[PDB]
A and B are shown apart, each in its own frame.
Chain A
């Protein structure tokens, strides 16, 4: 119904959120790669919403530029362990949202941080507020509530993102 897309930074392996973001019936213990093209129903902070999954290798972060236009609702994520590979994820919203398809519909558009139980982090908002990128305002959301793998904070920007649908 209401889809959700996430991309992630390069050279991380930070894609393991969607498994613990899925329900308790089919939780996965292996690390979940952000292959994308995922098809499942998961009970989110508003209702039983849908998802989508993609891979971010620099060589590979173009299939996410092949499914970027669409999506019922939306999705925000980042790598907040990156002290060098987070300069490149700055342009990723301008790849994602700057594109005409994303801009046209007032659905869910927010970018969130990650890797909190890892030994480095930054501002909670991260994507739209820490790395000088507060200017995502006309996008009709905001993103929050991030940990690393332990499973917190998916209902953090939910009033701006999840319960905003």
Chain B
């Protein structure tokens, strides 16, 4: 039980991930933030108003900001990395360090351990020591964050490198010692205290699927301690921090999300976490810190919001004064200030609109085209700094209305983010989205996502019936890799070095692996499904024109499918009688008469009825998958059986599984 009041502070421009920090300063600390235009600023919030300090000049988009100190001195040097170089400010507007670190594209993460500087890139990772290159690594996948264990509480510097493919490569020097496996692509990670864990060293990670962990990286192996795998708390962890807000004596875990959710985890079990307070914010949190910034003497949480609203959650009540008829006076002060500002701004912008109309805007959309694993549906999430007016969805929690015509979605009132599901079949590769904000010229920005023709994992099971398939002849390995990127959801674009790469995929609708190995001129695409290899054959032949069977595999796939169809049919059969039995329920109180069989349905009627709403889509998808399986497994032998479909449809209306397999093997 805990309550935090939402007190708002200065608003800055749109911010990236982990772009807010608190200067350690017993009184109120200072907040420092970085806008996407380069204007790094800092304030102190003396009394209600932000007393700005060294609001610098605009430049490149501030991709990361971190405060550190050379020796055990109180860390105060704030380093940013805007376009390709790391700039550094003291606790005032004096720039002292400007390391050019000439690179190709940009920086996406950086860590300052005194003089040691561990920076990331798209794929590259560098470790400098005072503008001197000392370590250089090139992962095969994009890096999300880099950290180094405390070089003081331990002796060796072991930088950890979080890759996009669900691994943490805990490398030393310029080569990986070992790799820890984690569920979901890691996005944030920070040692879980002001030191890095009492019992030596501990690394706390948070992934983009929504998952926390405490990988304890020893010299040669990790020691998993706990995990906060969630069910309802979906949303990419963009920030996490450690601070004792509850006041019990042990530091708590302040964790942010991508759907606004801010959570505090207490360790009252003395070893394991437990949720204590959660709060939604209507935007995407990008940075979280503890301490106090307003009215020293009360611990609070500072939360950087995507659009820039640097909000705080305080432990101090807001109703300080309560006399007579009343409705506080700070509300009246803020009201009057906003009144005056909006009057004068209306004057100016009306005159400028007149001048512009008589003489007659780029923005950012933090989109996230992820793939839900518990379902088979991508969950697209658009975000804009301002509010949206309408979103087109052209193809080849939400409060919006449908845009159906090609879906047009209008967003009611003043909403920034929009989450919409998209369910695509195992085939049908080929999706645009026009976003329009509520600004005056009312422009529109288009995004082009791809629905690929399988969530990638790290291991398969070779004891399954593998329906191998071999491509040979006249390839540049980069080109074959480009084909596989065209064909597979989660693969890095840059061709991995070594001219020989192997990936271990997995179908999410039902567990069937798709091991894919390939060299400079040869490729083996093993599988557990006939549909997967048929689709691969067709799409790869199409790409080329642009530029074996285990006789038991069908049995295995049908045995996989059977439980799902059985469950759907039982769903239908029970929901057919739910309401008829409910009509009998309302009389004679059900004391002695109802059969136990239907009595098992009278309780779970609610869940049955709410699953029946989604049933027909699953049934249609299963019928389509079965008919594609049948057609393809007859197509490999060289036949064309596009005509026997209606008999299969009738059989599935009956669904005699043994008669089904008989019709499969016979005709």
A and B touch in the complex (CB under 8 A): yes
**Are A116 and B317 within 8 A (Cβ)?**
yes
B322 partner, pick from A121, A152, A157, beta carbons under 8 A:
A157
Residues of A within 8 A of B637 (CB): none
B315 CB contacts on chain A under 8 angstroms:
119
Q: Assess whether A92 is interfacial by the CB under 8 Å rule.
A: no
The A-B contact count (CB < 8 A) is: 44
> Which residues of B295-338 have CB atoms within 8 Å of chain A's CB atoms?
297-298, 315-317, 319-324
Residue of A nearest to B2 (CB): A119
Does B589 sit at the interface, judged by CB under 8 A?
no
Residues of B within 8 A of A125 (CB): 322-323
Which candidate, A39-47, A61-69, A96-104, A138-146, is the interface stretch facing chain B?
A138-146
Contact between A124 and B317, CB atoms less than 8 A apart: yes
- A159 contacts B by Cβ under 8 Å: yes
Of B315, B317, B322, the most chain A CB neighbours within 10 A belong to B322
Give the nearest-CB partner of B323 in chain A.
A142
Which 5 residue pairs are nearest across A and B when measured between Cβ atoms? A124-B322, A125-B322, A142-B323, A124-B319, A144-B321
Residues of B within 8 A of A129 (CB): 322
Q: Report if A105 contacts B (CB, 8 A).
A: no
- CB of B6, distance to nearest CB on chain A (Å): 17
Residue of A nearest to B247 (CB): A119
Which of B247, B297, B298, B320 is the one whose CB lies under 8 Å from A145? B320
Some 29 contacts from A to B, beta carbons below 8 A apart, are A116-B317, A117-B297, A117-B298, A117-B316, A119-B315, A123-B319, A124-B319, A124-B320, A124-B321, A125-B322, A125-B323, A129-B322, A142-B322, A142-B323, A142-B324, A143-B322, A144-B322, A145-B321, A150-B297, A152-B320, A153-B320, A153-B321, A156-B320, A156-B322, A156-B323, A157-B321, A157-B322, A157-B323, A160-B323
Q: What is the bound-complex CA distance between A73 and B76, given in angstroms?
A: 53
Closest residue on chain A to residue B316 by CB atoms = A116
Interface core residue of B298, B316, B320, B324 (most chain A CB under 10 Å) = B320
**How far in angstroms is the closest Cβ of chain B from A118?**
11
Residues of B within 8 A of A (CB): 247, 297-298, 315-317, 319-324
- With a cutoff of 8 Å between Cβ atoms, the chain A residues found around residue B320 in the complex are 124, 144-145, 152-153, 156
Q: Which residues from chain B contact A121 at a C-beta distance below 8 Å?
A: 317
Q: Please name all residues of chain A whose beta carbon is closer than 8 Å to the beta carbon of B324 when the two chains form the complex.
A: 142, 160
Q: Do most interface residues of chain B lie in helix, strand or loop, or is the interface mixed? A: loop
Encoded as 1 (CB less than 8 Å from any B CB) or 0, chain A from 122 to 155 comes to 0111100100000000000011110000101100
The answer for the CA separation of A32 and B298 in the assembled complex, in Å, is 23
**A152–B321 CA distance with the chains assembled, in angstroms:** 11
Which residue of chain B has its CB nearest to the CB of A116? B317
Report the Cα distance A153→B319, complex, angstroms. 11
- Across-interface contacts of A119 in B (CB, < 8 A): 247, 315
A129 to B326, CA, bound (A): 12
- Across the two chains, which residue of chain B brings its CB closest to A121? B317
Residues of B within 8 A of A124 (CB): 317, 319-322
Give Cα A117–Cα B316 distance, bound, in whole angstroms.
7
Measured between alpha carbons, how far is A94 from B324 in the docked complex, in Å? 20
Q: A117-B298, A119-B315, A153-B320 are in contact. List 10 more A-B contacts (CB 8 A).
A: A116-B317, A117-B297, A117-B316, A119-B247, A123-B319, A124-B322, A125-B322, A129-B322, A144-B320, A145-B320
CB distance from A63 to the nearest CB of B (A): 29
CB nearest neighbor in B for A129: B322
Measured between alpha carbons, how far is A119 from B323 in the docked complex, in Å?
Answer: 24
CB distance from B518 to the nearest CB of A (A): 61
B319 / chain A contacts, CB cutoff of 8 Å: 123-124
- CB distance A159 to B323 under 8 Å? yes
Please, which residue of chain A has its CB at the minimum distance from the CB of B324?
Answer: A142
* Contact in complex: B323, A143 (CB < 8 Å): yes
Please name the residue on chain A nearest to B298 by beta carbon. A117
Separation of A119 and B4 alpha carbons in the complex (Å):
11
| Smallest Cβ-Cβ distance to A113: which chain B residue | B322
Q: Which residues of A contact B317 (CB under 8 A)?
A: 116, 121, 124
Alpha-carbon distance between A142 and B321 when the two chains are bound, in angstroms: 10
Please report the C-alpha to C-alpha distance between residue A124 and residue B324 in the assembled complex, in whole angstroms.
12
- Looking at the assembled complex, report how far the CB atom of B249 sits from the nearest CB atom of chain A, in whole angstroms: 14
CA distance A156 to B329 in the complex (A): 12
A83 to chain B, nearest CB (A): 11
* Shortest Cβ gap from A32 to chain B (Å): 20
Inter-chain contacts of B298 with A (CB < 8 A): 117
